[PDB]
Amino acid sequence: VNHNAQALNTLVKQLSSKFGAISSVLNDIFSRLDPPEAEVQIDRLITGRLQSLQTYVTQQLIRAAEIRASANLAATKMSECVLGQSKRVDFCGKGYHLM
Amino acid sequence: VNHNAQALNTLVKQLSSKFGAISSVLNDIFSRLDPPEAEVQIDRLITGRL
Amino acid sequence: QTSNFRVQPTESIVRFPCGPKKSTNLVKNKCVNFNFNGLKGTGVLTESNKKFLPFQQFGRDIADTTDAVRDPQTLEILDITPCSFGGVSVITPGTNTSNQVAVLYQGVNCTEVPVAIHADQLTPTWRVYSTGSNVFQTRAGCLIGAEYVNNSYECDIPIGAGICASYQTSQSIIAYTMSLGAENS
Amino acid sequence: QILPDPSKPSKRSPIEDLLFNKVTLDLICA
Amino acid sequence: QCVNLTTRTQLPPAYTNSFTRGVYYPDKVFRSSVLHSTQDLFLPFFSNVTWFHVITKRFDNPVLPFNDGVYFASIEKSNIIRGWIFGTTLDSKTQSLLIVNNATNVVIKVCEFQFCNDPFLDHKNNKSWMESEFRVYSSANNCTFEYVSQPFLMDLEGKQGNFKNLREFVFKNIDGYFKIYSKHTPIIVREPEDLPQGFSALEPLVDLPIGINITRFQTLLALHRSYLTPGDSSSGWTAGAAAYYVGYLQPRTFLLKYNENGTITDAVDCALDPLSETKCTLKSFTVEKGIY
Ligand SMILES: *[C@@H]1O[C@H](CO)[C@@H](O)[C@H](O)[C@H]1NC(C)=O
Ligand SMILES: *[C@@H]1O[C@H](CO)[C@@H](O)[C@H](O)[C@H]1NC(C)=O
Ligand SMILES: *[C@@H]1O[C@H](CO)[C@@H](O)[C@H](O)[C@H]1NC(C)=O
Ligand SMILES: *[C@@H]1O[C@H](CO)[C@@H](O)[C@H](O)[C@H]1NC(C)=O
C-alpha cells in the first residue's frame, strides 16, 4: 500500500516540473508567445511527461512480477500445507508439520 | 562480478558522450557562450546523463 | 475500454472583486468555467467551510492543485471540484452472436450521466433519451443497457466488485451477482 | 477464533478482524 | 535644520540567541495539514541575534547595514520604537525611505530628504505626553513617492510600568519591491533579559513597489521628557526601559507544518543539526529508529 501510494504521489507531483521549458502551464505557453516557437516548448513538456509515464509503468511491471512470484508461492502453500500434510522441511513452519 | 563491473564501466564511460551538445566538459559550455544560449546544451547533457 | 467520458462547461464566470471593469455572478453545484482574477479552469463551485486566513486567495490539496478559492467580493469559501473524467467500457457478447452492447461508466453516479462525450464530433445526440431505463448503479460505476436479476450464476464477463454479466434468454444482456459454487454440508 | 462470527455484519473471524483493523489504507481525489 | 547631538555612550554589543523565531508565510496560499519545503530568506534556528537597550543615558541609535533582509523585534510597553529610515547616503543626495508609525498615520515617504544626522524627537511633554516638535528632516527637492496606510492607535502616554507588547517586523527587498511582514502579540511579564522560547507565524501586512537601492537602515525612537529630565535637545533626556533586537536573514530551506486552519505551527530548519536534516530528507516530523 505504501509503495503504490508513493508511486502515485510521485507521478502527480511530477506534473509541476518544467523539464527545461519556461512554464508548466499550457495556456501560459499558448498565451505570451507564438505557436511555432511555443511548439518546441510543448514538445519538451510532452516528452517529459511521456518519460514520466513510461518510467511509472516499468516499475509497475517489475513490482507485478514480484507480487506474482509471491502469489504463486501462496498458492503452493495453500495446496500443500492446507489441503494436505507436507514432508518438506521448514515449508509450513518450524517443527514437524501437522496442519 | 563481471556483469556488475561491466555495467559500472558502461556508466562511467557514458560521461564522455556529447549527446548532441557542443562539448562534454561543463566549463567549456559555461565559458565562451552567453548562458541563455548555453542553457540548451546543459539541458541536453543533464537529460542524457539522467 | 474506450476512454470517452468528459462532461463539459455550461457557462463561464469571470467574477472580479467589485472592480476592474465588470463582475458576472456566483454559480453553485454545476459544471462551469471559472476565471477568478486570472484563474482560468473548469470546475464545480460548491461552497465550503475552510478558514482561509484573510490575506490568502488560493487553496491547494496534497498534490498542489487548486482546491478552494474565496469569493473575491462576497468573501465566501468555495471548493473547486472539476467535473470531468470517466472511462467508457463496452460489454459485448461477440459480434458473431449479437450486435447489442452494454456500457459501463467507471466511476460516476449516473444521476449525472446524460450530458456529454465531446472530442471532434462525438456528441450528446445519442444520449438525450438513451439514458431512459435499464440503468443499474454498481460499486464499479454504473451500467446502462443491462438488466439486474436476483439469480446467481457463474461469472461470464466480469464487470467488477462481485458483479458479472452475460447474454441469454427475446435475448438480452443480464447482470448478476456472481456465485461461488454449489452449497454443501 | 478462526471460524466466522455470525454476530457481526461482516462474517469474519476475530483474527480476521484484527488483521483488517491493523492495515490502514484527500490524495485520492487529487 | 538640526544641531548635532552629542554625549553618546559607546558600548560593546550584547548578544543573545534566537529561540526558533522569525518564520513567516512565503506565499499567498492556504494549505491544510501538509508539510511544505520552502527555500527562502529566513532567520536560522538558534542564531546569534543582536540586542540593543535604551533606558549618556544609554543612547542606542546605531547605523546598521541592510544586507539581505532584517528581522526586527521589540518587547515594549509604551511605544518608544516607532520608525525607520533606509537608504545609502541619507543626506538628500540619493533616494531615502522613511517609515513612521505614530499615533496619527503610518507614513511612508521615499525622497531625497536632508535628514538630521542624529534626528531630534524632542517631545515637549506636559501631563499629556504629546509630541510638540518634529525635527527629523529639513528639506525635499525633487521626489515622487509618498503613501499613507491604515494606522493603528497608540496611547502616547509616558508609561513606566510592565511590558506586555511584543512587536515583530520583517523587512525584505525582492525585485525592487519592499515587503513588510509583522506579528504584534501580547507577552507575559518575565525576567527582562531576552525574548523567550516560542513559535508564531508572521502574516504579511505592507507590500510596496518602491524600486530604489537600500543599503543601510536606522531606527527612529520616540523619547519622552519630563520634569525629572533637565537639559537641551541633545543631552537632557530619560526615556525608561525599552529594548530592541536585530537579526539577519539568510537563504535557508525550511520544512513547514501547515495546520488545518492554514497557520503554520511548527518548522524545521534544514541545516542546523543532522537530526533535523534527516527530518528534511524524510519529510516528516518524527523519525523511526534506524540509519538514513
Ligand atoms: C451518488 O448518489 C447517491 C444518491 O443521492 C448519494 O447518496 C451519493 O453520495 C452519491 N455519490 C457521489 C460520489 O456523488
Ligand atoms: C430482485 O431484485 C430487485 C432489485 O435488486 C428487488 O427489488 C426484488 O425484490 C428482487 N426480487 C426478489 C424476488 O427478491
Ligand atoms: C553571539 O556571537 C558572539 C561572537 O562574538 C559570541 O560571543 C556570543 O556568545 C554569541 N551568542 C550566543 C548566545 O552564543
Ligand atoms: C481552527 O482552529 C479552531 C480552534 O482550534 C477550531 O475551530 C478548529 O480546530 C480549526 N478549524 C476550523 C474550521 O475552525
Author numbering:
A (entry chain B): 755 to 853
B (entry chain C): 755 to 804
C (entry chain A): 311 to 479, 492 to 507
D (entry chain B): 607 to 631, 651 to 655
E (entry chain B): 14 to 68, 74 to 310
Reproduce the article's own wording on this structure.
Cryo-EM analysis of the S-6P-no-RBD protein indicated that the S particles (with truncated RBD) formed an open conformation, and the side and top views showed that they were missing the densities corresponding to the RBD regions. These data demonstrate that S protein without the RBD was capable of forming conformational structures for insertion of a heterologous RBD. The RBD-truncated S backbone protein forms conformational structures for insertion of the heterologous RBD fragment. The rationale for selection of the S protein of an early Omicron subvariant, BA.1, as the backbone of the vaccine constructs is that this subvariant was dominant during the time of experiments; also, the sequence of this S backbone region is highly conserved among the S proteins of different SARS-CoV-2 strains, including Omicron subvariants. All vaccines induced IgG antibodies against the test proteins with varying levels, and S-6P-no-RBD induced the lowest titer of such antibodies against WT-RBD and Delta-RBD proteins. Unlike other subunit proteins, S-6P-no-RBD induced low-titer neutralizing antibodies against SARS-CoV-2 WT (50% neutralizing antibody titer (NT50) < 1:500), Alpha, Delta (NT50 < 1:100), Gamma, or Omicron-BA.2.75 variants, but not against the other SARS-CoV-2 pseudoviruses tested. CD4+ and CD8+ T cells from all vaccination groups produced IFN-γ or TNF-α cytokines after stimulation with S-6P-no-RBD protein; cytokine levels were overall higher than those produced by splenocytes from the PBS control group. By contrast, S-6P-no-RBD-immunized mouse sera generated low or background neutralizing antibody titers. In comparison, lower-titer or lack of neutralizing antibodies induced by S-6P-no-RBD resulted in reduced protection and pathological changes in the lungs. Therefore, although S-6P-no-RBD did not induce, or elicited low-titer, neutralizing antibodies against most of the pseudoviruses tested, it did elicit specific T-cell responses, leading to the protective efficacy against viral infection.
